[PDB]
Amino acid sequence: HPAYPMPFITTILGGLYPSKSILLSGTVLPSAQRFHINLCSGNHIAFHLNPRFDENAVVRNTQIDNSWGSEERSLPRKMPFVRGQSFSVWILCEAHCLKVAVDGQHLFEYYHRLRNLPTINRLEVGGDIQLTHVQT
Ligand code: NI
Structure with missing residues (x-):
């Protein structure tokens, strides 16, 4: 399984709603400083997950x-x-x-x-x- 492009951007058709799941799999780089997962609405970031x-x-x-x-x-x-x-x-x-x-x-x-x-x-x-999989 090859890696996704980084950064990776994709539309979540239908947006969010109760019971909606977004799954991500990958590997933290050996000397990673930080990484983030954003759920966006137009020009805003509804949720910024930043390890x-x-x-x-x-x-x-x-x-x-x-x-x-x-x-x-x-x-x-x-x-x-x-x-x-x-x-x-x-x-x-x-x-x-x-x-x-x-x-x-x-x-x-x-x-x-x-x-x-x-x-x-x-x-x-x-x-x-290294992003290996996304389920939207
Ligand atoms: Ni898939």
Whole structure:
């Protein structure tokens, strides 16, 4: 299985709605600094999932009208992404929030800030990973 182009951008036809899942698989590069997965709506970023290896954290935020909101960095356990290690990310959309699992285990919830779910119709992936699969 070859790698996807990076950055990878694709339309999510129909946008989001409760029960909608977005799955991503790949491998963190050996000396990765950071990578991100964005769910976009027009010129806004409804959800920015940003693992940072330099900061050893998983940052989540929203960018509306070019302004970043308040970051969410809370984690119930140790940073699950590891340099040079393969991973899977499952983003499940619900009515009130996005539920995110990593390597098959629930990690955190992100309450919707951009609530018109059907308008969140673009996926963008970038950064220090080798993207091996996307299920939209
Ligand atoms: Ni496929």
